[PDB]
Structure formats: structure tokens, C-alpha cells
Amino acid sequence: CFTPESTALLESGVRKPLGELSIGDRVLSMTANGQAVYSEVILFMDRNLEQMQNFVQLHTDGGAVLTVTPAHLVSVWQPESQKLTFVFADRIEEKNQVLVRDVETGELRPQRVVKVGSVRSKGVVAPLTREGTIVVNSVAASCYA
Amino acid sequence: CFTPESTALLESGVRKPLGELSIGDRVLSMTANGQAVYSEVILFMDRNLEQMQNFVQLHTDGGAVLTVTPAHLVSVWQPESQKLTFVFADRIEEKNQVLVRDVETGELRPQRVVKVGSVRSKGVVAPLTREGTIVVNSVAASCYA
Known part of the structure; x- marks a missing residue:
């Protein structure tokens, strides 16, 4: 899960809090x-x-911060092997x-993830x-947690 | 969830029991x-x-039978509105x-689903x-349950 304050980006071009989604x-x-x-x-x-709830906070070099639960799957890019994989937030x-x-x-x-809080x-x-x-x-993630 | 005996279809062209997946x-x-x-x-x-476990069994007009848990999402086609939607197996x-x-x-x-067991x-x-x-x-479904 994410927080209610976390935001999604609607096709319309507007950010929307997950609690309002x-x-x-x-x-x-x-x-x-x-x-x-x-x-x-869909649901x-x-x-x-x-x-x-306890959340992991991933900070990116660009300034984005994704607050997600420990067991939520997140996309991780392996630059060397050009591989996109999913890893649990806490890992x-x-x-x-x-x-x-x-x-x-x-x-x-x-x-780059510059800080894990x-x-x-x-x-x-x-x-x-x-x-x-x-x-x-702004950070890509799976819907699964 | 599905049963261990339920089968997936590998890209190779072979059916594989989920318990062996x-x-x-x-x-x-x-x-x-x-x-x-x-x-x-991926996992x-x-x-x-x-x-x-208790399972819902969906029988199709073609002879396919999908055994899935009550709370598993399954694709449902609405012929009139050309809409593909997900519905819980039990619904x-x-x-x-x-x-x-x-x-x-x-x-x-x-x-057509010809029988629900x-x-x-x-x-x-x-x-x-x-x-x-x-x-x-042979029946399409979501991975979510």
C-alpha cells in the first residue's frame, strides 16, 4: 500500500491523492x-x-520520494543487464x-535511489x-503488495 | 488462487500444472x-x-473449466458494450x-459460461x-485474488 497523501497522475494531466482516487x-x-x-x-x-502503518521511503536522485509498505513490489532497473525486475520495497x-x-x-x-528511510x-x-x-x-511500482 | 492441477500454457507450447510452475x-x-x-x-x-480450499468452477460453452477461489478476479466480456471487465469468480x-x-x-x-459449480x-x-x-x-483471469 501507499499513503492517502501519495499521488497518482491522471491522464488529464493532474496529480490526485490516492485517498481521493x-x-x-x-x-x-x-x-x-x-x-x-x-x-x-478497477478497484x-x-x-x-x-x-x-509502517512505510519505506525511497528517495531518488531527482527528488522523488515514494512512500510504500515493506511488502509492496517496486520496479528496479538493472543498468548493466538492461533488466527490469520487481523487488519488495524493504529489500x-x-x-x-x-x-x-x-x-x-x-x-x-x-x-538512483539516494536514500532509504x-x-x-x-x-x-x-x-x-x-x-x-x-x-x-512519479515512481513506477507494481499494484501488488 | 487456482488448484495445483490447474494448467498454464507455456510460450513453448506446453501446458504446465500450476503446482509445477x-x-x-x-x-x-x-x-x-x-x-x-x-x-x-515473477512470483x-x-x-x-x-x-x-473452496473453489468456484466456471464451465464454458467450448468445454473449458476454470477452477478458481471465490475472491479471484476473472475477465468478463460484455458483448453489447464491447467492454472487458473484471468480476470476482463468485459473482x-x-x-x-x-x-x-x-x-x-x-x-x-x-x-458463454454454461454452468457454475x-x-x-x-x-x-x-x-x-x-x-x-x-x-x-484456457480461460483468461487476473492474477489478483
């Missing part, structure tokens, strides 16, 4: 080969805006690379899109 | 717009070959339509592919 909204997602694409939210696998470390949306081009491009906050939201992936706070 | 295997899946495509199994969300009824792989063409084509067996397997979907026993 609605089934049907077409949010920025990622294809199997790592490309940006818009997909509709929420978890949505409790009061539930206290991600500095120097690993994640896909972050580039403002100018709109493309999902790899960025933690935080405990209230509210959990886990949206499921048709694609099965979702870009939260 | 391995991470890395490229199984027949479905794209967001309902097309057949091969995707690799199992559930895999307990001993766990007794599916006769006359609804699901996507079934055609032998000759290999395409995922809609077929039930069964309790041992073993649960829930494979997750990169696409997020998987065709089990």
Missing part, C-alpha cells in the same frame, strides 16, 4: 516493458484512511535504480489498475 | 485490451499444495461471457506474471 480514474501506469501508459483503476485492494537499497517519470518527456527513466503514518491505499502497475509520486 | 516460466497471459501474450511468472502470491453467473483461448488461432475469444480440494496456487493476468485452463 476513484475507480474508473485513468492513472499513469507502466507496461511490462517499462513504458508509461494510462490505465483505469482498491486496501483502502483504510485511518489504519496506522531496496541505495544505489539500486527505480523508474521515475521525466517531466519534459513524460517517459519513465531510471534514477522509514515513517509510520495513518491510512493505507492500494489501487489496482488494469495494467497491474501504477506510478505513484 | 516455476518463477521465470513465460505463461500465456492477457493484455489490458484482452489480447493473448506471453509473460513471465507466487500463494502456493500451498496441501491447503484445503459470475451463467450467460456471462469469459475469454477462452481458441485452439486454431490462439486468440482469446469470448465464450463448486468443489473443495487441496492445494492453492496464485502465480503473478509481469502482465498481471494469466490464462488458466
Whole structure:
């Protein structure tokens, strides 16, 4: 899950807090080969805006910060082998690379994780899109947790 | 989840029991717009070959039978509105339509659900592919349950 304050990017061009996200909204997602694409939210696998939860915080070199639960799958780019893989949030470390949306081009491009933090906050939201992936706070991730 | 005896279709052209499925295997899946495509199994969300479980059994007009847990998402085709939607297995009824792989063409084509049964067996397997979907026993389904 992500936090209610975490944001998705609607096809319309607007960021929307996950706590305000609605089934049907077409949010920025990622294809199997790592490309940006818009997909509709079909349901929420978890949505409790009061539930206290522990979150991993991934900071990218570009300034993006993704707050996700320990067991949530996140896309990790292996620069050497040109391999896109999914790793649990808690297993991600500095120097690993994640896909972050580039403002100018709109493309999902790899960025170094420069800091791995933690935080405990209230509210959990886990949206499921048709694609099965979702870009939260500009960082690509799986919908699975 | 599906049963261990349920089968996936490997890109190689061979059916493989889910209980024998391995991470890395490229199984027949479905794209967001309902097309057949091969995707690799990245992990199992559930895999307990001993766990007794209640399953819904969907029979198609073509003879395919998909055994899935009540809370598993399955693709349902709405012929009138040309809409592909996901519905929980237990909410599916006769006359609804699901996507079934055609032998000759290999395409995922809609077929009427001619009978909805039930069964309790041992073993649960829930494979997750990169696409997020998987065709089990020739019937298209989401990986989510």
C-alpha cells in the first residue's frame, strides 16, 4: 500500500491523492516493458484512511520520494543487464535504480535511489489498475503488495 | 488462487500444472485490451499444495473449466458494450461471457459460461506474471485474488 497523501497522475494531466482516487480514474501506469501508459483503476485492494502503518521511503536522485509498505513490489532497473525486475520495497537499497517519470518527456527513466528511510503514518491505499502497475509520486511500482 | 492441477500454457507450447510452475516460466497471459501474450511468472502470491480450499468452477460453452477461489478476479466480456471487465469468480453467473483461448488461432475469444459449480480440494496456487493476468485452463483471469 501507499499513503492517502501519495499521488497518482491522471491522464488529464493532474496529480490526485490516492485517498481521493476513484475507480474508473485513468492513472499513469507502466507496461511490462517499462513504458508509461494510462490505465483505469478497477478497484482498491486496501483502502483504510485511518489504519496506522509502517512505510519505506525511497528517495531518488531527482527528488522523488515514494512512500510504500515493506511488502509492496517496486520496479528496479538493472543498468548493466538492461533488466527490469520487481523487488519488495524493504529489500531496496541505495544505489539500486527505480523508474521515475521525466517531466519534459513524460517517459519513465531510471534514477538512483539516494536514500532509504522509514515513517509510520495513518491510512493505507492500494489501487489496482488494469495494467497491474501504477506510478505513484512519479515512481513506477507494481499494484501488488 | 487456482488448484495445483490447474494448467498454464507455456510460450513453448506446453501446458504446465500450476503446482509445477516455476518463477521465470513465460505463461500465456492477457493484455489490458484482452489480447493473448506471453509473460513471465515473477512470483507466487500463494502456493500451498496441501491447503484445503473452496473453489468456484466456471464451465464454458467450448468445454473449458476454470477452477478458481471465490475472491479471484476473472475477465468478463460484455458483448453489447464491447467492454472487458473484471468480476470476482463468485459473482459470475451463467450467460456471462469469459475469454477462452481458441485452439486454431490462439486468440482469446469470448465464450458463454454454461454452468457454475463448486468443489473443495487441496492445494492453492496464485502465480503473478509481469502482465498481471494469466490464462488458466484456457480461460483468461487476473492474477489478483
